Design a protein around this ligand. Structure first.
Ligand SMILES: CO[C@H]1CN(c2ccc(C#C[C@@]3(O)CN4CCC3CC4)c(Cc3ccccc3)n2)C[C@H]1O
Ligand SMILES: CO[C@H]1CN(c2ccc(C#C[C@@]3(O)CN4CCC3CC4)c(Cc3ccccc3)n2)C[C@H]1O
Ligand SMILES: CO[C@H]1CN(c2ccc(C#C[C@@]3(O)CN4CCC3CC4)c(Cc3ccccc3)n2)C[C@H]1O
Ligand SMILES: CO[C@H]1CN(c2ccc(C#C[C@@]3(O)CN4CCC3CC4)c(Cc3ccccc3)n2)C[C@H]1O
Lengths: 341, 341, 341, 342
């Protein structure tokens, strides 16, 4: 049990936010999800550490999941801060893991492997196309959507029908991953070395050098490209609405809804906002408190997504080179919401 | 987007402290309040410029709210520092206003006009009586309490019932105002021409010349007069408590509460303190940081109000001439706080 | 095998209650009642869609029933919510419709056309007289009573002579629709475009304008008017009892009684209650669970109707203006009940 | 020539019998501006007043009614009856003439129109409950016209630019007219379908619980007592009317400005404490209005007439009347402002 207690502790240290959201789940499902997160997080720490060789990563990642059955395994020289501690003490995670249902372990083990191999794929190449963008998001986020959806069904909390078509589940992870990639542009490009995720297929029609977006000189093209990125993430909203409307359990719903509403709030804030290029744009502590509070049931959630979707569209005017493109994407999003009201 | 953005930069420039508090709000609520602030600050700038003929103000102020529906109106040789740019480029403010919802525009127009006329009353007469004091404070502060309240409701974030009886919203405005007037005595009286806000009805009981309190040879009376001003100020705390306890939205609550707790902490410092007469008593950067951080919810806000109230009390003597009044005003305050604990 | 599933899926989505009540019935009668509900629900969507031209509705409505055999038809831009998905996919309806006994088929078509042509009549005028009222209610609800009644006969579950005189069957419908109309005043009045159903005749004698009842200043006459609305509704009770007492099949009786008892309970709730003018007044969860549980046989059903009817009366003194008309009406209903006990 | 301008004057004479005469007597230059200004507002009013249209339409169309002033093709197809409807149909002539006016005249007209449109919207979706609502409603439909006309006097050069410094008295001019009509038109209004009410609850709720009660003779004591309160409220603007009139310098502007005020005082003195107000339309004799048009061309004569009408009004009440003290005071205040300019 002490191990399980370490997991929650490391969890809170590594991700304050998700560690509050996870508390919406019932203990059993919560334990499995917490461990699921720490597993992928440790995985993310290896892929991310740019101080270690690529061959080391392509050597360790593919078989990271196998370690789930080695209560003695742990890695010592990788990552920074808490993350680093997660790997050095990965023992607590794996053993906490072994006390999980067999159905949970399998989902976790499988998602971990598929994500790991997907990470290896993008370690030896960059994100050039939209197809690449969507696949990369699938590997790091979309699969977590799949994973969670399978854990929901396995817990019995949700119907078996949920996992029939894991498409909307993939959309769920994509909306969140994309909103973060859009929002963290500056911070990411300021890393050493730079971290780039925006697809060349998209940014290539606004600039020849992404780093140009950091300069006010090219502020018009930066915002124009920011706006195309938002347009690309909006594609997923209708599917996020469908998925959320199919959930029957209150806990699974709150845990699944909150992040999506936070993402829609953020996205509506980064849309057509030049500040995105020099700072981290975020919702107020007041607005996130309100979102966590009301995202416990469908109707309320749909109206908050509605509200934020309406605030997003209200930040533009005919003159913008996206107005038309964004406008129809907003109506699709709104229709789907009203499609359940 | 340049219109609203000018609003925020000027806001930050003209009032940095309140600029931080307004950032507790979000979306359209914040914009409305930002514009509301700028409209009244411009109004106040014109009203305060003593180089402007009283005759001009008497007719121009009452129609100031009318410039709101005229995106070409601006003023050019008025204001101190950044206040000048506000009047000169007022065009941005009115344009941003023209985009708020009709309900927000109305609260803003209405309050501005009512404050303008109230100022006009006091441009042709001094503050002699306590009734005058309360009425003057209602004109420049209480009404802001009224407006903000109407805006909270108009937004939907607080119940439509909050606006039934604006008596307490007025107390909110009067408590902040009186605390400032008390705290800025020295600075206000030490300029050409002297600004007197303390009602004769209170200070005549302690001297023939208010400008004499500066002298360290009339401190005993100055201090006794100060305590009298503090007592008068304390009358409003129970109502502030009541008003705060009726707020449901977290953003609106932080926004509304922070200035109040700051006010109470400042009141506990100037109370029975001679320094007020030769300098500007301010809180520590730590207390300020503390107040801004925890005033996000009722219980914690009340604990701080109680604490500052008790420290205000523990600073007096059974020997001091106000012991009796203050003690009652203090017990009235706490009784009301516990009333919501 | 797949078309009905859509009908049911959409039925539950479109109307949670009647979906539950609809399940009391035995499959044969069930599928028919389900398709019958949808057909009228789609019809109603087009009728109330304040988007489409009043000039256009009249043109089609009469056609609507004909579309029943046009298993390729579908309207794709009408209404909102799950209603839209219903119309755009009306195909599953029509085809599921061609598998029901030719007998069932005709009632649906016959009733639909009559209801359709009834909506057209009112799509041009207003509800002024109590006669306008009964007639309108006859088109939307009354005919449904006929339909369902003619379906009970066809099924062979009820005596073939149950449909000879349909006056009571029409009373079953008006009682439901009228009670709904009374309870939904606010919800209907606060619509854009506004929705009024209360007969000019009844409220001409109480206020000057109908929207006027929203104001708390007029609870006095808003309620008095409400009571006259209830008093009107109560006229149908005796005939609702008469009708339920004639049913012999357990299933038909349950499906037939539950809605009626629910209506009575709501009626006893809205009577002399100003909350009707600013909120949806409704039976508590416990009360409706009991209604569904006990309304399976005449005697228990009569006891529940009596109880509610007696609470309806217990909410007025010799003080009230409708007291006399009410006391009488309550009596007529109770006699009817006692007449079958 | 300018066939467009002739259309404006023919229609003006068809729609407003009252103001057409005073507008027509104006010095040619500013007259067209005033004519076109009246038409625009009357058009706006027609729309707003047609109850056979959805509030949602007006709330959606009135706020932009001023933008058509710059569109020579805009005209409205089917709203309002009589000559009023014909105006909106061929509104193209009004907008056509508007374009040949001085830019300053155009600006004044647009600004007031828009401010009025939006004010009608306000009271389109709510009621006049308080005396504040009353003054405000009168401000949107009449006071603002006083604002504009004043603005038009300055822009015309006929009056001093100083005239427009403080527009408070101008607003008083509008309210005195509008309030007198609302008082005199009580019955006509309340008999409308749907009924029309402008009398503020804050005043009538004190004499009845249902405004329709005054319709019948059984509540005649309270009706009249309420009518008298309304008149009192109206009398509040007279001192200000006097001040505005005494401040005009051009004879043409003065006659055009004064005649309607004198007609209002005359009508007020006749509806006051007069119970016929609740069953018919009380009005001055044609000879009285002819006498008023003839004499109200210079300050002294106007004051004198205003004075006699005010004294005629005060003589209609008795000590036993409730309003005695209130009226007697307002009367004495009006008469005093008149005496200060003599
Ligand atoms: C089906 O609805 C769900 C969709 N959700 C998702 C989707 C994707 C992710 C993720 C992720 C990461 O990219 C971020 N971080 C942790 C796991 C990976 C790699 C580094 C996350 C975060 C996460 C939560 C729980 C376990 C692991 C990861 N959540 C939460 C619900 O809205
Ligand atoms: C309901 O609780 C509220 C009470 N609050 C108040 C009350 C009064 C004022 C003010 C003010 C001023 O006197 C200062 N300054 C700017 C507006 C006037 C004239 C010159 C202000 C400042 C202000 C804030 C936002 C918009 C306008 C003014 N805030 C903020 C909350 O605690
Ligand atoms: C013989 O007694 C019956 C009386 N019942 C009624 C009477 C009327 C209606 C209805 C209706 C509607 O006006 C409401 N809504 C759905 C159908 C029409 C048009 C839009 C409805 C709803 C309905 C239920 C089943 C099939 C169709 C309609 N039920 C159910 C039993 O108590
Ligand atoms: C400066 O003093 C002036 C005050 N006067 C006023 C004041 C108000 C009005 C008016 C008006 C209306 O309410 C009547 N009608 C036409 C314009 C509005 C809306 C529907 C009118 C009518 C009118 C006359 C000429 C042009 C426009 C409006 N006149 C004339 C002078 O005594």
């Amino acid at each position: 049990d002490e191990d399980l207690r370490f997991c929650y502790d490391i969890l809170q240290a590594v991700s304050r936010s998700f560690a509050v959201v996870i508390m919406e789940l019932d203990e059993e499902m919560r334990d499995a999800v917490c461990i699921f997160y720490l597993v992928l997080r440790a995985l993310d720490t290896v892929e991310d550490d740019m101080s270690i060789p690529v061959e080391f990563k392509l050597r360790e990642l593919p078989k990271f999941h196998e370690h789930l059955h080695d209560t003695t395994w742990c890695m010592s020289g990788v990552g920074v801060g808490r993350e680093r501690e997660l790997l050095e003490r990965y023992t607590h995670v794996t053993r906490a893991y072994s006390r999980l249902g067999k159905a949970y372990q399998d989902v976790i083990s499988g998602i971990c492997e598929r994500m790991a191999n997907g990470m290896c794929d993008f370690l030896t190449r960059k994100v050039e196309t939209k197809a690449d963008y969507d696949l990369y998001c699938h590997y790091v986020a979309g699969l977590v959507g799949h994973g969670l959806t399978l854990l929901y069904v396995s817990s019995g909390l949700e119907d078996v029908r949920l996992a029939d078509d894991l498409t909307n589940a993939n959309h769920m992870g994509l909306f969140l991953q994309k909103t973060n990639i859009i929002r963290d542009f500056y911070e990411d490009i300021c890393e050493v070395p730079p971290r780039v995720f925006w697809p060349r297929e998209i940014w290539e029609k606004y600039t020849d050098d992404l780093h140009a977006f950091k300069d006010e000189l090219h502020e018009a093209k930066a915002v124009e490209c920011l706006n195309a990125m938002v347009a690309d993430a909006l594609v997923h909203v209708p599917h996020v609405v469908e998925y959320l409307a199919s959930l029957r359990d209150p806990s699974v719903f709150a845990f699944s809804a909150i992040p999506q509403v936070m993402a829609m709030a953020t996205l509506s804030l980064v849309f057509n906002n030049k500040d995105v290029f020099h700072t981290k744009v975020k919702t107020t502590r007041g607005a996130t408190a309100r979102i966590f509070h009301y995202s416990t049931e469908l109707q309320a959630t749909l109206q908050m997504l509605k509200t934020y979707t309406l605030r997003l569209a209200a930040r533009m005017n005919a003159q913008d080179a996206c107005y038309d493109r964004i406008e129809h994407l907003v109506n699709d999003a709104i229709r789907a919401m009203e499609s359940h009201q």
